[PDB]
Every structure is written in C-alpha cells, then in structure tokens.
From a paper:
The tripartite motif (TRIM) proteins form one of the largest subfamilies of RING-type E3 ubiquitin ligases, comprising more than 80 members. TRIM family members typically contain a RING domain usually catalyzing ubiquitin transfer; one or two B-box domains mediating protein–protein interactions; and a large coiled-coil domain region, which is involved in self-association or oligomerization with other TRIM E3-ligase proteins. About two-thirds of human TRIM proteins feature a PRYSPRY domain, also known as the B30.2 domain, in their C-terminal region. All characterized family members shared the same overall PRYSPRY twisted β-sandwich fold consisting of a 7-stranded and a 6-stranded antiparallel β-sheet.
A characteristic feature of the putative substrate-binding site in the closely related homologs MID1 and MID2 is an arginine located at the C-terminus of β-strand 7 (R587 in MID1 and R637 in MID2) that projects its guanidinium group toward the center of the cavity and two neighboring tryptophan residues lining the pocket. The orientation of the side chain of the two tryptophan residues in MID2, Trp602 and Trp694, showed an intriguing variation in the crystal structures. The MID2 domain was solved in two different crystal forms. In the C2221 crystal form, which contains one protein molecule per asymmetric unit, the side chains of Trp602 and Trp694 engage in π-stacking interactions. In the other crystal form, in P212121, which contains two molecules per asymmetric unit, an alternative orientation was observed in one of the two chains, with the side chain of Trp694 swinging out of the pocket. CASTp analysis detected a pocket with a solvent-accessible (SA) volume of 56 Å3 in chain A but only a much smaller subpocket at this site in chain B (SA volume = 1.8 Å3). In some cases, such as MID2, it may be possible to target transient protein states with more open pockets, provided these states are sufficiently populated in solution.
Numbering used by the authors:
A (entry chain A): 531 to 559, 575 to 710
B (entry chain B): 530 to 559, 576 to 710
The structure:
C-alpha cells in the first residue's frame, strides 16, 4: 500500500474549525464545517482512519477539486462520503444516498481509497467490518475530506492496511 | 527507527466493568478501571499514543508484573504513570507525584518507552511538546497500562513516532 501521510489543510478548512498544531485534530471553535486533507491522490491504495468519538453528525470521504470548498457532504458529483446522523448511517454521492448498517458504538471509521482499482471503501475497524464500497472509476485526483457540526475529529493517516482488509 | 509493534488490551488484564472493542483498542466505562497491554517489553524503543477524548480522570503508563492487577496508577514502586484528575496533571510513581504543566485541551498523549536507555517519556504530540521524562533503570519487563475513572480511551500502537521525537 501507498498510504501517503497527510494533515488537515489550513487553506481548505472552515474558519469555525480549530486545527491542532500537528494538523491531525480539529474541533469546532449551510451548517457544515468541512476540512480537506493536504494531499491529492491519483494512484495507489491508501488507508486512513478517523476517530470521531461521540460525534453524532459528520461526513467523511473524498472529493475532486471540482467539488467547491466546504461542499464535501456527497451533494455533488465530486464528493463521496460516509455520513452519520444520529443512528442513521448513509453513504452519499451526487445527492444519492444509501443506508448502511453499522454496529452500535461506532467511534472510529476506516477509509480505504484503492485508486488504482476504482474503489472507495468504508470500514468499522474496531469490528474488523466492511461497511460499504463505492465502485468509482476516478477521473481526477481526490483529496480526503472531513466535515462535522460539533465536537472533534482526529485523523490517523499513512496507515498500513489493517490485517483484516 | 522505533521498535513499536501493534499491541492491544490483554483481555485477562481488563477490569470487569470496562467495555472493550473487539480489536482490543478501545476501552470505555459505562474505584479506578485499569487495563494492560498484551505485551511485556524488555528491549528496544517503543512509542504509542492514547486518545483520551473528554475523559477527565485517567492514568496512563507502564508497569512491572509486580504491580498488583488494577494498581497501575503510580501508587507502588512497579507503576509509572501520567495522570489527569480534572484540571490537574501529574506524573506519579511509588506513591509520589509531581505536577506537570500541560497545554490546554490535551486530547492525546504520547508515551515513549525507551527501554534500552532506561527512560519513560510523556508527550503532547498535538503540540510537539515533551511533558515529562522518568529515568528508570528497568529491572523487569514492563507492560503498557491504561486506567480510567470515566469516559473512554483509544490506543494507537505500532504507528511511526512523530518527526519531532
């Protein structure tokens, strides 16, 4: 795997978000406060995790540059996200959403971007569990996106594929 | 480079009232509640991190096997911990504690066990900041220990040390 490490991009992060000095944590200081990773990916296979804790409302995924800044909740043709709203989990892309069954107490999300094999997959790593795979023939470079309403989020990047993947 | 390997909580060392994720990396309380990592270290240099989130009372460190089970909060000669209790941070060993100046909003603790060079160091990795170093001539192998009185912890093991260390 090619898992390039990355940080949250201060140039692409909503002003209502405070980013840690090491670029791996964000918390709140349309209503959606988005941040983008500081890399674009156009090859290889990459895995990162997000620690969401008790956050009840978020959208995590990837986007083309053709997705406008802070529009990373799967409501255009350039944004793919896994999203939580209370007990309802969906994947969403181009305003089309599909319900995803998730075991209770999801605190950490795994994101597997297999760019070369045209897949974006979401995982519940605590349960070693695949949640959903988008089959996408990517036509532009993609960057990680993280959108929250409140509370906080930490990114675990540059990761080897977990043994169960 | 570091010798850090992935470890998880040892199920046989976990307090009965802790809820543990299936991958052994998350512990939650629904009298301190201690758990120990499933590795005893007697060589090399190791780094792991703990995500504490909103927990206001925890103790994180290492222990010899001679520390009694669940007595991993620095109140014997076999336990070295970094601990938060509300707004006070201390390191504690052999039932003696020293206050530690910690920047606000510590959500993640770095633990650097340099077993070969007889040191245990605690870090605020978000701020690339050294917090405390114990000099310890280790006479037995040591295991990671994690103790909470509320909320939850997540263990980040086997990941590359941050560049600043």
């Amino acid at each position: 795997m090619n898992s390039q490490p990355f940080k949250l991009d201060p140039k692409m992060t909503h002003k209502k978000l405070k980013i840690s000095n090491d670029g791996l944590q964000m918390e709140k200081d349309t209503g959606c406060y988005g941040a983008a990773g500081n890399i674009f990916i156009d090859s290889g296979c990459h895995y990162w995790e997000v620690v969401m804790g008790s956050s009840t409302w978020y959208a995590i995924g990837i986007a083309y540059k053709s997705a406008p800044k802070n529009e990373w909740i799967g409501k255009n043709a350039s944004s793919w996200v896994f999203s939580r709203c209370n007990s309802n989990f969906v994947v969403r892309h181009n305003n089309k959403e599909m319900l995803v069954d998730v075991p209770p107490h999801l605190k950490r999300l795994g994101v597997l971007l297999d760019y070369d094999n045209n897949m974006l997959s979401f995982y519940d790593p605590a349960n070693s569990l695949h949640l959903h795979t988008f089959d996408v023939t990517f036509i532009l470079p993609v960057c990680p996106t993280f959108t929250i309403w409140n509370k906080s989020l930490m990114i675990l990047s540059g990761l080897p594929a977990p043994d169960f993947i």
